[PDB]
Amino acid sequence: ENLWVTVYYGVPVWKEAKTTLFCASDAKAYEKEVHNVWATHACVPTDPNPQEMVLKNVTENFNMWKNDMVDQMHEDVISLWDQSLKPCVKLTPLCVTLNCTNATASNSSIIEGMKNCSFNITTELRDKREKKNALFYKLDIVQLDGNSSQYRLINCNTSVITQACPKVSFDPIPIHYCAPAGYAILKCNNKTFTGTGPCNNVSTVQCTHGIKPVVSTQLLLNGSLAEGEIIIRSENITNNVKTIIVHLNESVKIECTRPNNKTRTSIRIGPGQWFYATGQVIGDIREAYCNINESKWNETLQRVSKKLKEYFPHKNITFQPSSGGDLEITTHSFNCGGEFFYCNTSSLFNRTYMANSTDMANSTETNSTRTITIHCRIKQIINMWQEVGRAMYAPPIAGNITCISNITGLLLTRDGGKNNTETFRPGGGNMKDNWRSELYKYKVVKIEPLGVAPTRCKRRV
Amino acid sequence: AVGIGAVFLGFLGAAGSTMGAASMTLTVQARNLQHLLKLTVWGIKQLQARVLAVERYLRDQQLLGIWGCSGKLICCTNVPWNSSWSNRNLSEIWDNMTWLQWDKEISNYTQIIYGLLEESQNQQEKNEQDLLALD
Amino acid sequence: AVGIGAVFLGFLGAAGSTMGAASMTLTVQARNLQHLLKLTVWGIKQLQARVLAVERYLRDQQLLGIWGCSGKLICCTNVPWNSSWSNRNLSEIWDNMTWLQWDKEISNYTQIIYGLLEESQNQQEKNEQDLLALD
Amino acid sequence: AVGIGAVFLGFLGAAGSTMGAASMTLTVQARNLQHLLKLTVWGIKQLQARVLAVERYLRDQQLLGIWGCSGKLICCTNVPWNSSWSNRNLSEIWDNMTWLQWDKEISNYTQIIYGLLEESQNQQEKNEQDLLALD
Numbered sequence: 001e002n003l004w005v006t007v008y009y010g011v012p013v014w015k016e017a018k019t020t021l022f023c024a025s026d027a028k029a030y031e032k033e034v035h036n037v038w039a040t041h042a043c044v045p046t047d048p049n050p051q052e053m054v055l056k057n058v059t060e061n062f063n064m065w066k067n068d069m070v071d072q073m074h075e076d077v078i079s080l081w082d083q084s085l086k087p088c089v090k091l092t093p094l095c096v097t098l099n100c101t102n103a104t105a106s107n108s109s110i111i112e113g114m115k116n117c118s119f120n121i122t123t124e125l126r127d128k129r130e131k132k133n134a135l136f137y138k139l140d141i142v143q144l145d146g147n148s149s150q151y152r153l154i155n156c157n158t159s160v161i162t163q164a165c166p167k168v169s170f171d172p173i174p175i176h177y178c179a180p181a182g183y184a185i186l187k188c189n190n191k192t193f194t195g196t197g198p199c200n201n202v203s204t205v206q207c208t209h210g211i212k213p214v215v216s217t218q219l220l221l222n223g224s225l226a227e228g229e230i231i232i233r234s235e236n237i238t239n240n241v242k243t244i245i246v247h248l249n250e251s252v253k254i255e256c257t258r259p260n261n262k263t264r265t266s267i268r269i270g271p272g273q274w275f276y277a278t279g280q281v282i283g284d285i286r287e288a289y290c291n292i293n294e295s296k297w298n299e300t301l302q303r304v305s306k307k308l309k310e311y312f313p314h315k316n317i318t319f320q321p322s323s324g325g326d327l328e329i330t331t332h333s334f335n336c337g338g339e340f341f342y343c344n345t346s347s348l349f350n351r352t353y354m355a356n357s358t359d360m361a362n363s364t365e366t367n368s369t370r371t372i373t374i375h376c377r378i379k380q381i382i383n384m385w386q387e388v389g390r391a392m393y394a395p396p397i398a399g400n401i402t403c404i405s406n407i408t409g410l411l412l413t414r415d416g417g418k419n420n421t422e423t424f425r426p427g428g429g430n431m432k433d434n435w436r437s438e439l440y441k442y443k444v445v446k447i448e449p450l451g452v453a454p455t456r457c458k459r460r461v
Numbered sequence: 462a463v464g465i466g467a468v469f470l471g472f473l474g475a476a477g478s479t480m481g482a483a484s485m486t487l488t489v490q491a492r493n494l495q496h497l498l499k500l501t502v503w504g505i506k507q508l509q510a511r512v513l514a515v516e517r518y519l520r521d522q523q524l525l526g527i528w529g530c531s532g533k534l535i536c537c538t539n540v541p542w543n544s545s546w547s548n549r550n551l552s553e554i555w556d557n558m559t560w561l562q563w564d565k566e567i568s569n570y571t572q573i574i575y576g577l578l579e580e581s582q583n584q585q586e587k588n589e590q591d592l593l594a595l596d
Numbered sequence: 597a598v599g600i601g602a603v604f605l606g607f608l609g610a611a612g613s614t615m616g617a618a619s620m621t622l623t624v625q626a627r628n629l630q631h632l633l634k635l636t637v638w639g640i641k642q643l644q645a646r647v648l649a650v651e652r653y654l655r656d657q658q659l660l661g662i663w664g665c666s667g668k669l670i671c672c673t674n675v676p677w678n679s680s681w682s683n684r685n686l687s688e689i690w691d692n693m694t695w696l697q698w699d700k701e702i703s704n705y706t707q708i709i710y711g712l713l714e715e716s717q718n719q720q721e722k723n724e725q726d727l728l729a730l731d
Numbered sequence: 732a733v734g735i736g737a738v739f740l741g742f743l744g745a746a747g748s749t750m751g752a753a754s755m756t757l758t759v760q761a762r763n764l765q766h767l768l769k770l771t772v773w774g775i776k777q778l779q780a781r782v783l784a785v786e787r788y789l790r791d792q793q794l795l796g797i798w799g800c801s802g803k804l805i806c807c808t809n810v811p812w813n814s815s816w817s818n819r820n821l822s823e824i825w826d827n828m829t830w831l832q833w834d835k836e837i838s839n840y841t842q843i844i845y846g847l848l849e850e851s852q853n854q855q856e857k858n859e860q861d862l863l864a865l866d
């Protein structure tokens with residue numbers, strides 16, 4: 001008895017492969033109302049049709065941390081900010097001074113250092129330049145000259161000085177990625193939704209359903225709801241402190257906006273440029289005043305300690321408020337498309353959790369209804385993108401705005417985890433890890449339509 | 462023709478049934494065979510992909526020509542296969558694995574196997590040709 | 597210049613009248629070989645057409661492939677026909693029928709015939725390879 | 732995907748000069764295998780060519796099928812080189828001439844050679860009935 005070679009075509013096989021992919025997108029969120037706009041650019045309208053066939057008896061490996069798609073769409077998308085790099089106004093590429101004590105407006109505002117100010121040491125030192133003026137809050141009063149300071153325009157000292165003026169759009173449109181022909185996208189499913197290692201009810205698609213941008217330092221929001229409880233994800237959960245993420249059953253709300261009004265006094269500044277010198281004091285009495293339905297927060301932590309009991313046995317367990325550094329590390333982050341803002345995760349999140357045969361001591365509170373209120377910061381001059389030398393003085397918007405959100409998950413780190421009362425904080429992570437959200441469902445493969453085997457059949461000669 | 466059964470050419474759907482069984486399924490899966498604006502822009506990319514699928518299929522079909530095979534789906538050749546890498550014996554292959562493990566049993570040596578298929582196909586002409594070349 | 601039923605399907609749209617000589621001629625016929633903005637939209641459907649023609653033609657050639665012929669715009673078999681589907685004398689078929697008559701006096705035995713072709717092909721090419729198999 | 736060898740198929744560039752080395756390595760010479768709205772037009776026009784190049788490639792495949800050389804890369808049939816074709820001789824062609832020279836010699840006889848192939852192939856089919864016409 002003996003064997004020989006034979007070859008087959010249409011053989012069911014693929015291999016995992018780095019590649020680009022191309023994108024479907026919303027069909028009306030951009031239209032002829034937004035000529036040449038970056039959201040209008042490139043990738044195509046929406047596909048209603050993504051079919052599947054089942055992998056009956058059949059299963060596959062996954063790893064959300066290893067997968068390349070995080071880079072695929074960390075690339076492309078940030079080029080909105082590259083398109084947004086408008087030139088500096090003629091008055092302020094240099095570190096100009098400003099003069100004020102109370103505001104140049106009719107009063108300084110009801111809350112904090114809003115003491116609006118004229119430019120003064122301003123190129124020509126001339127009325128055409130020094131008549132022009134800015135909204136104030138905080139970083140705008142930084143020291144220049146001596147005591148009785150003529151305050152620093154801080155935006156000069158970094159490689160890019162710019163503003164993304166209000167014509168630019170930031171709407172979190174759902175992209176629907178599809179792989180090139182002969183590639184395919186495989187979707188993992190089981191109630192064991194862990195997102196690394198083997199997966200059982202694995203499934204096939206030409207394209208993903210829609211997934212949306214997000215821009216948070218600590219609390220993920222406004223997107224993909226979980227499958228029916230809560231779960232935690234990590235690269236190697238045995239690790240001391242390496243970043244952890246938590247995914248939520250029920251979208252607990254954040255109930256606030258900062259409707260402090262300043263009027264639409266934009267200016268065709270200098271040699272025919274544009275600037276947003278918003279002034280006057282109608283509607284000036286107003287603040288962020290933020291609030292949350294406490295029980296709908298409380299449920300998560302009081303369940304989460306049980307979940308953590310599976311990963312870290314019997315110990316008392318703890319969260320503490322967010323880590324120090326800049327306000328951004330010190331906070332959860334958002335902008336409505338109206339003002340840049342940073343809430344105090346460094347006061348909140350302070351709870352310990354008992355975990356013996358426990359029936360006690362795991363929360364903020366129990367049995368009150370009531371809800372809660374919380375306080376939060378603003379930063380109107382921003383290192384507008386982290387990890388780049390780019391900075392902007394933000395363009396304001398009038399009145400209240402159509403904004404509020406609800407939370408899909410936590411970004412998390414296990415700070416201090418070498419002693420009992422096993423400790424954690426909100427925050428950590430790469431800016432990339434926003435886009436981990438839902439993407440644990442997927443991997444990309446290349447088809448390989450032929451293969452070779454032994455047989456008993458000896459060929460003709 | 463018809464709406465897509467999740468997969469186009471390559472027609473993948475018997476996925477990880479037994480290799481022995483798959484030969485029947487495979488042979489059968491042969492035997493049967495803005496108003497207008499940005500939606501017309503989109504109307505290139507999938508067609509361009511449709512062309513790239515044809516490009517791949519034809520580029521890869523040419524290889525079978527070099528192996529002296531015509532889409533005749535069970536082409537065979539007296540290169541021996543000769544056991545010693547995964548060794549299983551016949552049923553113990555075809556009744557166990559998926560092709561999606563036969564790759565993890567064997568990739569690599571593939572790059573020599575293509576050469577065996579080339580030089581053996583050239584032998585299966587040469588070894589007749591030289592006996593005709595006696596005159 | 598090139599043959600034309602469609603732009604290359606059915607190598608003349610006009611039939612040569614008669615299933616005899618026209619079949620021979622087909623082999624020799626195969627042998628011989630604003631305004632702008634919405635116009636850039638008009639440049640879609642003819643593309644789709646040329647692609648679909650290739651798609652159909654390759655699906656068709658794959659059916660020939662599994663039947664163990666390719667190119668070979670006429671091909672012979674080892675499949676019998678047991679003197680009972682019209683039995684018209686063979687000259688009289690060749691001389692008096694278009695295929696656009698065999699389309700009615702014959703046809704819809706097609707599925708059975710396609711079966712006979714495939715089954716015989718596979719079973720035959722296994723016979724030689726089975727008779728060769730011993731060592 | 733991949734680069735270019737004069738054309739995205741056919742892959743001229745390994746010209747080889749002497750036909751000897753080129754023919755003796757012909758296998759490896761292929762076995763190695765508005766924002767942006769006007770990107771519509773700058774896809775359309777080369778797409779047309781790209782498709783029509785595949786159609787050209789299919790014209791070639793048709794001739795290769797017609798000569799009974801489907802999927803082959805070197806091929807031959809019955810037809811002799813019967814003496815009156817230029818007498819340049821085997822040992823006095825490849826080693827002292829180029830493919831471009833050989834065309835510039837041979838250009839006269841092309842259709843005649845093609846017809847001789849056509850005839851011989853069509854005879855070779857029916858010639859087997861000299862043995863097989865048992866009924």
Ligand SMILES: *[C@@H]1O[C@H](CO)[C@@H](O[C@@H]2O[C@H](CO)[C@@H](O[C@@H]3O[C@H](CO[C@H]4O[C@H](CO)[C@@H](O)[C@H](O)[C@@H]4O)[C@@H](O)[C@H](O[C@H]4O[C@H](CO)[C@@H](O)[C@H](O)[C@@H]4O)[C@@H]3O)[C@H](O)[C@H]2NC(C)=O)[C@H](O)[C@H]1NC(C)=O
Nearest residue numbers: 226227228229230231248249250299300302303304306307
């Ligand atoms: C996320 O979102 C989901 C959906 O909105 C929330 O609710 C889940 O809902 C189901 C259905 O009610 C819950 O399952 C139920 O749990 C009850 C309590 O179970 C404990 O106590 C019983 C005795 O009552 C013990 O036997 C048991 O071991 C547990 O210790 C049960 O009383 C319910 O029983 C019913 O179902 C069974 C099974 O079919 C029937 O045979 C019975 O007759 C009876 O009708 C039921 O099992 C589930 O607990 C909720 N999920 C979770 C994980 O909480 C989630 O609450 C919400 N939040 C989270 C953290 O997931």
Ligand SMILES: *[C@@H]1O[C@H](CO)[C@@H](O[C@@H]2O[C@H](CO)[C@@H](O[C@@H]3O[C@H](CO[C@H]4O[C@H](CO)[C@@H](O)[C@H](O)[C@@H]4O)[C@@H](O)[C@H](O[C@H]4O[C@H](CO)[C@@H](O)[C@H](O)[C@@H]4O)[C@@H]3O)[C@H](O)[C@H]2NC(C)=O)[C@H](O)[C@H]1NC(C)=O
Nearest residue numbers: 170171172221222334336337338397401402403404405406
């Ligand atoms: C989470 O998901 C929610 C729900 O979709 C988002 O909030 C909605 O955002 C849309 C889009 O902006 C709002 O719809 C339209 O808003 C226009 C106003 O634009 C201002 O507000 C956005 C932020 O939402 C700023 O970025 C921008 O600079 C502007 O300051 C209105 O002009 C539209 O008017 C139409 O609808 C109203 C009724 O809503 C009618 O009275 C009008 O006649 C007209 O037909 C429109 O309202 C939508 O209102 C928002 N809803 C809520 C509940 O806030 C979040 O933005 C999204 N992201 C996050 C992180 O939470």
Ligand SMILES: *[C@@H]1O[C@H](CO)[C@@H](O[C@@H]2O[C@H](CO)[C@@H](O[C@@H]3O[C@H](CO)[C@@H](O[C@@H]4O[C@H](CO)[C@@H](O)[C@H](O)[C@H]4NC(C)=O)[C@H](O)[C@@H]3O)[C@H](O)[C@H]2NC(C)=O)[C@H](O)[C@H]1NC(C)=O
Nearest residue numbers: 221222223225226249250251252253254296405406407408
């Ligand atoms: C956190 O934000 C998210 C995103 O905004 C909220 O998600 C989902 O929001 C909807 C609407 O507020 C909730 O209510 C159900 O919505 C569906 C879909 O609209 C309704 O079903 C049917 O929908 C069609 C088309 O819209 C409509 O014609 C039908 O009339 C309608 N009803 C029926 C019986 O056919 C359904 O009735 C509900 O109104 C969803 O519950 C919610 N998603 C999930 C999974 O809960 C989310 O609500 C928000 N959470 C908080 C606390 O802020």
Ligand SMILES: *[C@@H]1O[C@H](CO)[C@@H](O[C@@H]2O[C@H](CO)[C@@H](O[C@@H]3O[C@H](CO)[C@@H](O)[C@H](O)[C@@H]3O)[C@H](O)[C@H]2NC(C)=O)[C@H](O)[C@H]1NC(C)=O
Nearest residue numbers: 252253255291292293294295296297368369370371372373
């Ligand atoms: C914060 O959220 C809680 C929980 O949603 C709110 O409290 C209670 O919410 C439930 C629904 O989840 C209410 O139940 C409904 O009551 C009516 C009768 O009033 C009944 O007809 C319905 O069938 C249903 O049972 C419940 O009334 C409500 N209780 C109280 C005291 O409020 C709470 O109101 C939220 N607070 C804020 C300010 O967001």
Ligand SMILES: *[C@@H]1O[C@H](CO)[C@@H](O[C@@H]2O[C@H](CO)[C@@H](O[C@@H]3O[C@H](CO)[C@@H](O)[C@H](O)[C@@H]3O)[C@H](O)[C@H]2NC(C)=O)[C@H](O)[C@H]1NC(C)=O
Nearest residue numbers: 545546547561562563564565566567568569570571572573
């Ligand atoms: C097919 O070929 C490869 C070699 O080309 C076979 O071995 C695999 O080779 C890579 C690269 O050497 C190995 O990764 C390296 O392993 C060392 C030692 O563990 C580690 O120090 C390096 O950081 C790196 O990870 C890989 O482990 C190895 N894989 C296995 C399973 O041996 C491969 O085995 C061949 N395929 C088969 C099925 O034989």
Ligand SMILES: *[C@@H]1O[C@H](CO)[C@@H](O[C@@H]2O[C@H](CO)[C@@H](O[C@@H]3O[C@H](CO)[C@@H](O)[C@H](O)[C@@H]3O)[C@H](O)[C@H]2NC(C)=O)[C@H](O)[C@H]1NC(C)=O
Nearest residue numbers: 680681682696697698699700701702703704705706707708
């Ligand atoms: C397909 O082969 C069958 C024989 O196997 C051919 O004849 C079949 O004959 C009966 C009786 O005429 C057809 O039933 C009905 O006949 C009436 C009157 O002719 C007609 O009005 C009905 O529409 C229906 O056809 C039967 O359908 C028919 N079989 C089929 C599948 O057509 C038949 O001539 C051959 N047909 C073709 C298109 O090759």
Ligand SMILES: *[C@@H]1O[C@H](CO)[C@@H](O[C@@H]2O[C@H](CO)[C@@H](O[C@@H]3O[C@H](CO)[C@@H](O)[C@H](O)[C@@H]3O)[C@H](O)[C@H]2NC(C)=O)[C@H](O)[C@H]1NC(C)=O
Nearest residue numbers: 816817831832833834835836837838839840841842843844
């Ligand atoms: C077939 O081959 C011939 C020669 O390589 C190609 O050129 C034509 O050849 C004839 C015969 O030499 C030329 O006719 C006359 O020839 C004599 C002797 O050489 C000369 O004295 C006359 O002045 C005249 O040239 C004919 O003119 C020449 N054609 C051209 C346009 O120069 C012929 O083109 C090849 N045909 C094919 C289809 O390959």
Ligand SMILES: *[C@@H]1O[C@H](CO)[C@@H](O[C@@H]2O[C@H](CO)[C@@H](O)[C@H](O)[C@H]2NC(C)=O)[C@H](O)[C@H]1NC(C)=O
Nearest residue numbers: 321322323324325327330344345346347348377
């Ligand atoms: C409220 O926000 C401030 C930032 O404006 C938080 O600032 C620091 O945060 C770290 C981490 O919690 C602490 O170690 C520092 O001691 C805080 N500094 C100051 C001056 O407060 C602050 O923690 C938050 N408020 C409270 C009461 O925690």
Ligand SMILES: *[C@@H]1O[C@H](CO)[C@@H](O)[C@H](O)[C@H]1NC(C)=O
Nearest residue numbers: 542543544545546547548570
């Ligand atoms: C076959 O023989 C080669 C040497 O000719 C050897 O390297 C290889 O391991 C053997 N087994 C297989 C399955 O190829």
Ligand SMILES: *[C@@H]1O[C@H](CO)[C@@H](O)[C@H](O)[C@H]1NC(C)=O
Nearest residue numbers: 676677678679680681682683
């Ligand atoms: C052949 O005989 C079978 C029954 O054996 C019958 O079904 C079929 O119609 C006959 N005709 C032809 C030409 O095969």
Ligand SMILES: *[C@@H]1O[C@H](CO)[C@@H](O)[C@H](O)[C@H]1NC(C)=O
Nearest residue numbers: 811812813814815816817843
């Ligand atoms: C071959 O034979 C034909 C006649 O059958 C003759 O005309 C021709 O010159 C011969 N030589 C070649 C190479 O065609």
